[PDB]
Write a protein that binds this DNA or RNA. Structure first.
Ligand SMILES: C#CCOc1ccc(C[C@H]2NC[C@H](O)[C@H]2OC(C)=O)cc1
Ligand SMILES: [K+]
Ligand SMILES: [K+]
Ligand SMILES: [K+]
Ligand SMILES: [K+]
Ligand SMILES: [K+]
Ligand SMILES: [K+]
Ligand SMILES: [K+]
Ligand SMILES: [K+]
Ligand SMILES: [Mg+2]
Ligand SMILES: [Mg+2]
Ligand SMILES: [Mg+2]
Ligand SMILES: [Mg+2]
Ligand SMILES: [Mg+2]
Ligand SMILES: [Mg+2]
Ligand SMILES: [Mg+2]
Ligand SMILES: [Mg+2]
Ligand SMILES: [Mg+2]
Ligand SMILES: [Mg+2]
Ligand SMILES: [Mg+2]
Ligand SMILES: [Mg+2]
Ligand SMILES: [Mg+2]
Ligand SMILES: [Mg+2]
Ligand SMILES: [Mg+2]
Ligand SMILES: [Mg+2]
Ligand SMILES: [Mg+2]
Ligand SMILES: [Mg+2]
Ligand SMILES: [Mg+2]
Ligand SMILES: [Mg+2]
Ligand SMILES: [Mg+2]
Ligand SMILES: [Mg+2]
Ligand SMILES: [Mg+2]
Ligand SMILES: [Mg+2]
Ligand SMILES: [Mg+2]
Ligand SMILES: [Mg+2]
Ligand SMILES: [Mg+2]
Ligand SMILES: [Mg+2]
Ligand SMILES: [Mg+2]
Ligand SMILES: [Mg+2]
Ligand SMILES: [Mg+2]
Ligand SMILES: [Mg+2]
Ligand SMILES: [Mg+2]
Ligand SMILES: [Mg+2]
Ligand SMILES: [Mg+2]
Ligand SMILES: [Mg+2]
Ligand SMILES: [Mg+2]
Ligand SMILES: [Mg+2]
Ligand SMILES: [Mg+2]
Ligand SMILES: [Mg+2]
Ligand SMILES: [Mg+2]
Ligand SMILES: [Mg+2]
Ligand SMILES: [Mg+2]
Ligand SMILES: [Mg+2]
Ligand SMILES: [Mg+2]
Ligand SMILES: [Mg+2]
Ligand SMILES: [Mg+2]
Ligand SMILES: [Mg+2]
Ligand SMILES: [Mg+2]
Ligand SMILES: [Mg+2]
Ligand SMILES: [Mg+2]
Ligand SMILES: [Mg+2]
Ligand SMILES: [Mg+2]
Ligand SMILES: [Mg+2]
Ligand SMILES: [Mg+2]
Ligand SMILES: [Mg+2]
Ligand SMILES: [Mg+2]
Ligand SMILES: [Mg+2]
Ligand SMILES: [Mg+2]
Ligand SMILES: [Mg+2]
Ligand SMILES: [Mg+2]
Ligand SMILES: [Mg+2]
Ligand SMILES: [Mg+2]
Ligand SMILES: [Mg+2]
Ligand SMILES: [Mg+2]
Ligand SMILES: [Mg+2]
Ligand SMILES: [Mg+2]
Ligand SMILES: [Mg+2]
Ligand SMILES: [Mg+2]
Ligand SMILES: [Mg+2]
Ligand SMILES: [Mg+2]
Ligand SMILES: [Mg+2]
Ligand SMILES: [Mg+2]
Ligand SMILES: [Mg+2]
Ligand SMILES: [Mg+2]
Ligand SMILES: [Mg+2]
Ligand SMILES: [Mg+2]
Ligand SMILES: [Mg+2]
Ligand SMILES: [Mg+2]
Ligand code: NA
Ligand code: NA
Ligand code: NA
Ligand code: NA
Ligand code: NA
Ligand SMILES: [Zn+2]
Lengths: 89, 258
RNA sequence: CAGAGGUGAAAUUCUUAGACCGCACCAAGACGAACUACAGCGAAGGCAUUCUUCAAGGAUACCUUCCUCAAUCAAGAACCAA
RNA sequence: AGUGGUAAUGCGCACUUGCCAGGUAACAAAUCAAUCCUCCCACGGUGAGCUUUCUUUUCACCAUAAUCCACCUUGGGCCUUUUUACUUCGCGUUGUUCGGAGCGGGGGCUCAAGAUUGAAAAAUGCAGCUCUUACUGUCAUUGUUGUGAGUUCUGCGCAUUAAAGCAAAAACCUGGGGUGU
RNA sequence: CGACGUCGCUUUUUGAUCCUUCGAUGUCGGCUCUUCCUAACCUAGCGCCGCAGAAGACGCUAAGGGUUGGAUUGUUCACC
RNA sequence: GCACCGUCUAGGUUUGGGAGUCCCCUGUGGGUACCCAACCGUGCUGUAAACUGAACCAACGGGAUUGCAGUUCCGGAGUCUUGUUUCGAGACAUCUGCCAGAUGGGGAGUUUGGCUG
RNA sequence: CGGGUAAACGGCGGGAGUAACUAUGACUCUCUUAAGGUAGCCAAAUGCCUCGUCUUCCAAUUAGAGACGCGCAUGAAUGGAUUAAUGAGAUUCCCUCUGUCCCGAGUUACUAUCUAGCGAAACGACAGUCAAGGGAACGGACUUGAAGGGCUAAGCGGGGA
RNA sequence: CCCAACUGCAGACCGUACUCAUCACCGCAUCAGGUCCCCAAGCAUAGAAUGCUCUGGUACAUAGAGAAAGGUACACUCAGGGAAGUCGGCAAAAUAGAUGCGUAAGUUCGCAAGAAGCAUUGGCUCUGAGGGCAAAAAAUUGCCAACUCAGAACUGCUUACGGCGGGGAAUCCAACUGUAUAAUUAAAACAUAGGUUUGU
RNA sequence: CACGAGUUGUUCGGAAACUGAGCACAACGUUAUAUCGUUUUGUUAGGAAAGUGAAGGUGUGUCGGCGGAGCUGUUCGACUUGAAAAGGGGCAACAGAGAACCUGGGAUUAUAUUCCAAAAAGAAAUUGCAUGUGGGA
RNA sequence: CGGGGAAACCCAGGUGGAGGCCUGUAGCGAUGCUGACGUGCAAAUCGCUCGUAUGAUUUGGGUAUCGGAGCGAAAGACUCA
């Protein structure tokens, strides 16, 4: 059976620190502990090993990106711009 | 009176960097002959975390250009760099994320990090996590490149200064609320002795200009002159304005006519 | 070079520290005039520069396929200008 | 002037700090299994205590150091083979898993913890005693069970909350080249 | 009982003074305990009244004896 | 004015010149497709999407002392220097001293009358 | 001199009249500021008056709570209002409970107490019964009276200002 | 000259007693204060709580006699009343383990909560359930260890070791965990996460 | 209090011999004055701080092969030409790193993994030199 | 792993062992008795009671910052009574 109604992993804080600060931290706390897709090896095995460090369990590759997610939205746009500027030359 | 805390920290003493457990300065490779005329190929060996720094660090192995040995330089890792990646540094390096190129070889609008303020300084700009510079234009007459700094300021540097393509890894760190005094305790454990912070109005008048009073108050304006001597220069130093900013946050810093 | 702005008329406002006006430019964010119609597309809300792209949608055409698989609805679900 | 095995890798095969590259030293939660030992049982020997009455009883003891030789139990890594292993799957943990980037099954290689045989080592130690004084001799005993309870040695790390990611060096080890050639 | 006036008493109020104490005389209130005064609330007598009775007013001798439990407030006072 | 100091090049493009496929069996092995000059270029043998390799202590070719081997230089690995390690700035700058003025409880020293029911 | 800036220091009005009974004042006039205290909150740990006024709590309420607001002198990061959880924080009431009390009683250990051994300190002008009187206006000494045989053990807190 | 198994010879320096504390150190002292590390038994029990005990250690801290008052206590009890005491329930009393049932307003949905409240518990003699190993519908046949829980009959209480929350309705303040005036103030003070501003 | 005794190590702890937070000798600079400052972000100092040495050539010693005990050439250790090695000398841990011994004793009045003597009660493990054997050179 | 549902998803059991979470030793502190003592055991101690006790935790050794200076989660606290 479901053990909490609204908070999930945030239930470890009890009644402390306020609902809005808990909600904002919950989104990043869930993502920083989740499995992210590995473009190499095609597995969902990327885990954070420190702020900005991601190591895939499947292929043992280490990637630098994102404090709480594997790839920030800014990096996705930057990757597209660089490839576009590379083809223009 | 007594020496104010802000002035006491200039002696160093117990307020210095907690440098133990740090891997060392992070820098680009030396701007040598191979960089100036060709390129050097390196292999990313590891991605490591250093205490007190949000951005990830990369150990890149190069061959010595003159001797039979390896070099193994340590630089700030851009986002997306991975172990086993080939890194190209030099004049002829292709435009790709993680490569280090002269600023004059980089197109308008390319996002760069680890930018050299002066040619050969091994990277001094856009080094904090999630930060980057935007190239505005080049001017071939005077050999200068114009870029937009992370603070919004516009700066011109020689075109021979090197930049790394991409953005610094570890972005989004500040968007997570700390929620706990203990979490702030661990954050500054690797940096220096600067936390917790005691308000000046909470101190005694012997220690701080804001100290004293039968009520906790600053009895004088907190905006102080730029010429005030140390011990008097506390509060809002040489503030151009105060209060809530409405209708656009202006670019902070000093005006540069360039 | 001595006003400009603005209104029924004015004044607040800007201006010899050069406003307004004139020419070619630079930056930034909006917007896509005329063509624009009792015209088109979309379930509605809505949708107007060009090029390159990605999934769809309708109509029409058919001596293709198939064989009642449908209509409308509590509950439930998704979308919805400002 | 090394050598065997399809392979994992095996074998007693020279020099190397000219040089170069790696490794050891070298760090890390919790859960669960748990070592040496400790404590309890069960059975059995030896001595002592209680003994108006009971008590096949109560208590004590029943020990094996380093260093070596030879070589079935668990856990991990790996090799080979069969892989027609995942279409309205399978193996495994108490536990968060895992697999065509090769799961399971057969057969193997290896590493780590321990069994076990023996040398050491009974010639020692412990307890009681014969003889008769000499801190004398003779002689008897000289243990095994436990799906019992503890026990961080170990399994155990690219290993913890983490905007916390957890010293270094000497010394040593192995290889790449080269020497021998 | 007593206006306009007038003569006193007291030291349970405050004020006035600055004699004693500044090489120090322990500050309010309450609790406890004893004693003293009388300008007498009750208790013993006795006068007088706008003193029928009842209940009271005023006054004299008398301080031997007695003079409470609580809510609020640190309170003294105050109030119920 | 002339002449000397004073000169060599990767690669790219196009002007002259001369000069050597063969063995073993359809396959395999070895080998030949060059030099010069002009123009550009400017010191240039590797990469233009990235997933982890190795590279040292020279071969070789000349000149002297068929071939081969000693002691040698030479080049392989261009040469030169009105000279600066290189880059940026630059005769300014607070860069150095001195003189001068503002600001300056950051700090120092001192003072903050008398009479008095 | 001229611009900007209050999440800089800070600041944020007075009088008079006025609605079919009266009261009150939506409304009006006038003096004036840099602006004249907005949303909120309150006799609040901030209100002088003050034990404010009303309701509630009690047999009885200078206490507590809820209301009201001319607020001596409330008020918005000199942060305003609210707030679950938390608190050796301040306050009021109820149940339970009791020697807190009515109103005290009994018992125990160790003392005190007596003995053997051992053995200090503080303090110490001299001393040490009162009444009244004067007196530096509160005497143990002085005046006039009243007491007072000497030496001792345990206590006790009136005095020894 | 270099390897293998031996063999021969030689293996220098300093520390080493004792103590580590209710007597060996600091506190003027053999001072109820302070002072880091290792080994750590049995029973009760959740147990490094607390109580008692084998081993080891100790009987050393001036004693004897011994019901005055008044004291101090890591000592108790008290009829009837039950906070009338007091500034104030200070102090004391009170609650109490485990198990089943049950639990309000409010709320940041996490709590509040052990909310509040009812009920059971002993001893005996039994009965079920919860396993391991071995042996060719083995859905049975043997052997055996450690305990736990539950349910019955009978029989009890003088409610009886230790240990172990009193609870509820509200206001004020601070969000919370923390810190902090060694030696009269632990708080509402400081910090804190969050918010804003300034310089660069 | 007096007198007289007691502390025994190749392996235990330290040092010899590691680095850490750090210190500060040299060097340089400063100060009227060094009794001041810098001195680990790989690291002193305008800074010539390496005395160590691949390979060779040249002699000696231990070998090897060839042809006629010697000769040539050659392998490896001793003695006499110079590749490459940037960044001076040291301290700071008796709980980090490191570290070849462990039982029995009737062996004390008091020390003991420290003492025990030929049956070392004994069983080991480790360095440094050598000799001989076996095998390569 | 059951149960529902067209879907979105929802409801039930178990497993697991998070937290500047709670009760509670050692440890680290010090609330009240305004208790004892107050020429003390003590120039700050004793008793009971009490806060906290996986964390901003406690502690050994070493090392670094001091006198108009140092250090201070800020009491003018502490810098050998
Ligand atoms: C404040 C105030 C007013 O209340 C007092 C209370 C006491 C005292 C002390 C004097 N009383 C007599 C003598 O002069 C002094 O005694 C001592 C021991 O100094 C003064 C004033
Ligand atoms: K700090
Ligand atoms: K102040
Ligand atoms: K103009
Ligand atoms: K006085
Ligand atoms: K009478
Ligand atoms: K504090
Ligand atoms: K010095
Ligand atoms: K701190
Ligand atoms: Mg200083
Ligand atoms: Mg602060
Ligand atoms: Mg203060
Ligand atoms: Mg000041
Ligand atoms: Mg304040
Ligand atoms: Mg303030
Ligand atoms: Mg248009
Ligand atoms: Mg909108
Ligand atoms: Mg490791
Ligand atoms: Mg008077
Ligand atoms: Mg006087
Ligand atoms: Mg006195
Ligand atoms: Mg006096
Ligand atoms: Mg007195
Ligand atoms: Mg009378
Ligand atoms: Mg009387
Ligand atoms: Mg009387
Ligand atoms: Mg000044
Ligand atoms: Mg001054
Ligand atoms: Mg005067
Ligand atoms: Mg403004
Ligand atoms: Mg108002
Ligand atoms: Mg008010
Ligand atoms: Mg007044
Ligand atoms: Mg009351
Ligand atoms: Mg109120
Ligand atoms: Mg005000
Ligand atoms: Mg105000
Ligand atoms: Mg404001
Ligand atoms: Mg007298
Ligand atoms: Mg007295
Ligand atoms: Mg007395
Ligand atoms: Mg010894
Ligand atoms: Mg000893
Ligand atoms: Mg001890
Ligand atoms: Mg001493
Ligand atoms: Mg002393
Ligand atoms: Mg105990
Ligand atoms: Mg116990
Ligand atoms: Mg005993
Ligand atoms: Mg004693
Ligand atoms: Mg005794
Ligand atoms: Mg004593
Ligand atoms: Mg008594
Ligand atoms: Mg009362
Ligand atoms: Mg009373
Ligand atoms: Mg009272
Ligand atoms: Mg109490
Ligand atoms: Mg509810
Ligand atoms: Mg309120
Ligand atoms: Mg608080
Ligand atoms: Mg806590
Ligand atoms: Mg607290
Ligand atoms: Mg502190
Ligand atoms: Mg204090
Ligand atoms: Mg206190
Ligand atoms: Mg505060
Ligand atoms: Mg806020
Ligand atoms: Mg002596
Ligand atoms: Mg002697
Ligand atoms: Mg430095
Ligand atoms: Mg160091
Ligand atoms: Mg040095
Ligand atoms: Mg230097
Ligand atoms: Mg040392
Ligand atoms: Mg020591
Ligand atoms: Mg050690
Ligand atoms: Mg040793
Ligand atoms: Mg001894
Ligand atoms: Mg838990
Ligand atoms: Mg806690
Ligand atoms: Mg707790
Ligand atoms: Mg608590
Ligand atoms: Mg202790
Ligand atoms: Mg007291
Ligand atoms: Mg006393
Ligand atoms: Mg405790
Ligand atoms: Mg000093
Ligand atoms: Mg103060
Ligand atoms: Na530093
Ligand atoms: Na508190
Ligand atoms: Na006197
Ligand atoms: Na007399
Ligand atoms: Na003691
Ligand atoms: Zn992967």
């Amino acid at each position: 059976a479901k053990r909490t109604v609204k908070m999930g992993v945030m239930g470890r804080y009890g009644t402390r620190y306020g609902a809005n600060p808990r909600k904002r931290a919950k989104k990043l706390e869930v993502s920083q502990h989740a499995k992210h897709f590995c473009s190499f090896c095609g597995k969902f095995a990327f885990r954070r090993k420190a702020v900005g460090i991601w190591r895939c369990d499947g292929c043992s590759k280490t990637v630098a990106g994102g404090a709480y997610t594997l790839s920030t939205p800014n990096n996705s746009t930057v990757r597209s711009t660089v490839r576009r500027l590379r083809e223009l030359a | 009176g007594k020496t104010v805390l802000s002035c006491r920290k200039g002696n160093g003493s117990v307020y210095q960097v907690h440098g133990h457990k740090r891997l060392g300065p992070a820098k680009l490779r030396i701007l040598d002959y191979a960089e100036r005329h060709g390129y050097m190929r390196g292999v990313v060996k590891s991605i490591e975390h250093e205490a007190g720094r949000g951005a990830a660090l990369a150990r890149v192995e190069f061959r010595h250009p003159y001797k039979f040995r390896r070099v193994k330089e340590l630089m700030v890792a851009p986002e997306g760099m991975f172990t086993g990646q080939s890194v190209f540094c030099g004049q002829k390096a292709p435009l790709a994320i993680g490569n280090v190129l002269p600023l004059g070889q980089i197109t308008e609008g390319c996002i760069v990090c680890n930018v050299e303020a002066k040619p050969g300084d091994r990277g001094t700009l856009a080094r904090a996590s999630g930060d980057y510079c935007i190239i505005i234009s080049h001017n071939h007459e005077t050999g200068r490149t114009r870029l937009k700094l992370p603070s919004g300021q516009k700066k011109s540097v020689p075109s021979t200064s090197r930049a790394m393509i991409g953005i610094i890894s570890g972005g989004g760190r500040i968007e997570k609320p700390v929620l706990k005094a203990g979490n702030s305790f661990y954050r500054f454990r690797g940096k220096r002795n600067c936390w917790p912070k005691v308000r000046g109005v909470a101190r005694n008048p012997v220690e701080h200009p804001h100290g004293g009073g039968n009520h906790q108050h600053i009895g004088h304006p907190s905006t102080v002159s730029r010429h005030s001597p140390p011990g008097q220069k506390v509060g809002l130093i040489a503030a151009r304005r105060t209060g809530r900013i409405r209708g656009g946050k202006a670019v902070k810093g000093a005006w540069h006519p360039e």
